[PDB]
Design a protein around this ligand. Structure first.
Ligand SMILES: O=C1CCN(c2ccccn2)CC1
Ligand SMILES: [Zn+2]
Ligand SMILES: [Zn+2]
Length: 582
């Protein structure tokens, strides 16, 4: 308690000594409250005019238009302590899993240079604005690194002064750039050295790319076993127990020297003890603390969520296979039974899964898994949108399974070769491409963001008639040499000024390990679409009068946007499509 968090609390108390008051009408029940102080401030979603002017038919579709308009009673709930049997299963599995992930990898510190390079090419390091303007300026100033140095030596001494979260089914925990650096230095290796790649972790998909995920799910489907299960957890980050954070910290058992001490301090001082500041309109700032739940940088959050989800799903697989009888207590005989299962079949059981943070697909040995719920519920990983003891419903066809907000189609090229393509309802894709975040967008910056969406559609969603057409229109409307941009940056192969047919060939043919015949495609007309009825099922407007008028008159829409941008060099990409090819 206050020995570890008191120093951070003390320091904030004094900077607002004028305003400090133990408010008696504080809304917190599960968060430990400390005090309040005076503040006054808040970032809505803005429309991308380039994408909207080239998608006119969607101006009258509420599922698109409503996306641009506009639970903290889940952060303030509690999780119960797991039973002794559950605690044993988790400790044994976590010990085994860190060793497997560690066999071909070496834990190491990430560098100031690595951190600096990340800030100098816009990575979302969930930092706050103050003594320097942006992250880019702090990183160039030697005074910043001296503050970093002070905190760093405090961590080596087992104490913390400035690593405090700022809060804002979503929740982001911004920290000052310094606290973020010390997290990256100690635990960045998990992401930087690809500990959750599929090659290294067998279940993971880190670095895989949306063009690989369907092929990975089809490979899982080829295993003998039962249905494919894809159960979503209700509020995963809020269900991370103190036992989970202790099993995650066991990665430090694999470290040495300074690194070991710096990592032990991140886990002890910032993860297993948290200090948070939250805006309340009654506008004050509340200083609250708690020991459990996930509150880390988004990239460390992804790797540890993947770790703890792999652990939870192996234990659910053990329960289905009858490796243990009850979560109340494991016998030392069962303990040897659990380790032996892991040693003999653990790697095979990991390969039956695709796990992306809180998102999983599992093809178990048989359907006993569906009703194997005692460990999953007792670990706190309660399933969304199903009663606690109702058996999971599985998917009989890998093309139906949801994963990473997509489903996947098997698409046969005119030449016989097989593509496995990503897909989701087309209203979601169009509605997201019509939105920007933040202020001060020039017309050129807005155009270059529209071009990023268009080139993503050409590479990932070429099989959707409306998106191939709208992608060609946007790329025709934006100057040919203008570089696609994002402010917030899987593999993003569409982020390039290379010809999109050349990139398509590289991604789907040359580098595709599921494609034996490497014969290049010579034109976009060789690249297939879904069936027309399937395209409509997944939200196409093909068949509507509004869509036919848009497609027929597309050069008029392209010319409207070119006239706004002005006298620039443009390319016509529409004749890459059969219907505009004379
Ligand atoms: O190779 C192995 C997989 C099967 N396993 C067990 C152990 C107890 C109960 C069910 N299966 C033994 C080890
Ligand atoms: Zn600290
Ligand atoms: Zn689809």
């Amino acid at each position: 308690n206050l020995d570890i968090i008191g120093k951070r609390i003390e320091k904030i108390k004094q900077e607002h000594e004028t305003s400090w008051h133990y408010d008696q009408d504080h809304p917190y029940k599960t968060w430990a409250y400390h005090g309040s102080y005076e503040t006054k401030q808040t970032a809505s979603s803005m429309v991308n005019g380039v994408v909207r002017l080239l998608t006119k038919p969607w101006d009258i579709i509420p599922m698109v238009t409503q996306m641009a308009m506009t639970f903290k009673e889940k952060v303030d709930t509690r999780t119960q302590e797991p039973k002794e049997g559950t605690k044993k299963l988790m400790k044994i599995t976590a010990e085994w899993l860190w060793k497997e992930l560690g066999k071909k990898k070496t834990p190491r510190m990430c560098t100031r240079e690595e951190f600096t390079r990340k800030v100098r090419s816009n990575a979302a390091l969930g930092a706050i604005f103050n003594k320097w303007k942006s992250a880019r300026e702090a990183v160039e100033d030697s005074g910043f690194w001296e503050l970093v140095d002070k905190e760093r030596n405090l961590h080596l001494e087992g104490k913390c002064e400035t690593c405090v979260y700022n809060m804002m089914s979503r929740a982001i925990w911004y920290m000052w750039l310094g606290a973020r650096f010390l997290e990256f230095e100690a635990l960045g290796f998990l992401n930087e050295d690809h500990w959750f790649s599929r090659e290294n972790s067998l279940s993971g998909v880190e670095g895989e790319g949306l063009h690989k995920l369907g092929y990975i799910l089809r490979d899982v489907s080829k295993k003998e076993g039962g249905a494919m299960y894809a159960d979503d957890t209700a509020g995963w980050d809020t269900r991370i127990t103190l036992e989970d954070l202790k099993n995650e910290e066991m990665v430090t058992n694999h470290m040495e020297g300074e690194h070991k001490k710096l990592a032990e301090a991140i886990f002890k001082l910032t993860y297993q003890n948290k200090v948070v500041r939250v805006q309340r309109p009654t506008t004050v700032m509340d200083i609250i603390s708690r020991r459990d739940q996930r509150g880390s940088g988004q990239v460390v959050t992804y790797g540890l969520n993947t770790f703890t989800n792999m652990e939870a799903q192996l234990i659910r697989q053990m329960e289905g296979e009858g490796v243990f009888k009850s979560i109340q207590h494991l016998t030392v005989t069962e303990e040897i039974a659990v380790k032996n299962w892991l040693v003999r079949v653990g790697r095979e059981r990991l390969s039956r899964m695709a796990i992306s943070g809180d998102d999983c697909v599992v093809k178990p040995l048989d359907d006993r898994f569906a009703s194997a719920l005692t460990a999953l519920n007792d670990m706190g990983k309660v399933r969304k949108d199903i009663q606690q003891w109702e058996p999971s419903r599985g998917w009989n066809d890998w093309t139906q399974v949801p994963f990473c907000s997509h489903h996947f189609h098997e698409l046969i090229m005119k030449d016989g070769r097989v593509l496995v393509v990503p897909c989701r309802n087309q209203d979601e894709l169009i509605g997201r491409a019509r939105i920007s975040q933040g202020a001060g967008w020039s017309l050129r910056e807005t155009a270059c963001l529209g071009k990023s969406y268009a080139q993503m559609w050409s590479l990932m969603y070429f099989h959707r008639r409306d998106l191939r057409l709208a992608a060609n229109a946007i790329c025709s409307a934006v100057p040919s040499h203008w570089v696609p941009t994002s402010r917030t940056t899987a593999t993003h192969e569409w982020m390039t000024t290379e010809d999109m047919l050349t990139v398509w060939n590289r991604v789907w043919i040359q580098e595709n390990p599921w494609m034996e015949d490497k014969t290049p495609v010579e034109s976009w007309e060789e690249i297939p679409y879904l069936g027309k009825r399937e395209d409509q099922w997944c939200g196409s407007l093909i068949g509507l009068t509004s869509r036919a008028t848009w497609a027929k008159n597309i050069q008029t829409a392209i010319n409207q946007v070119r006239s706004l941008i002005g006298n620039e060099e443009y390319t016509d990409y529409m004749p890459s499509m059969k219907r505009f090819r004379r």
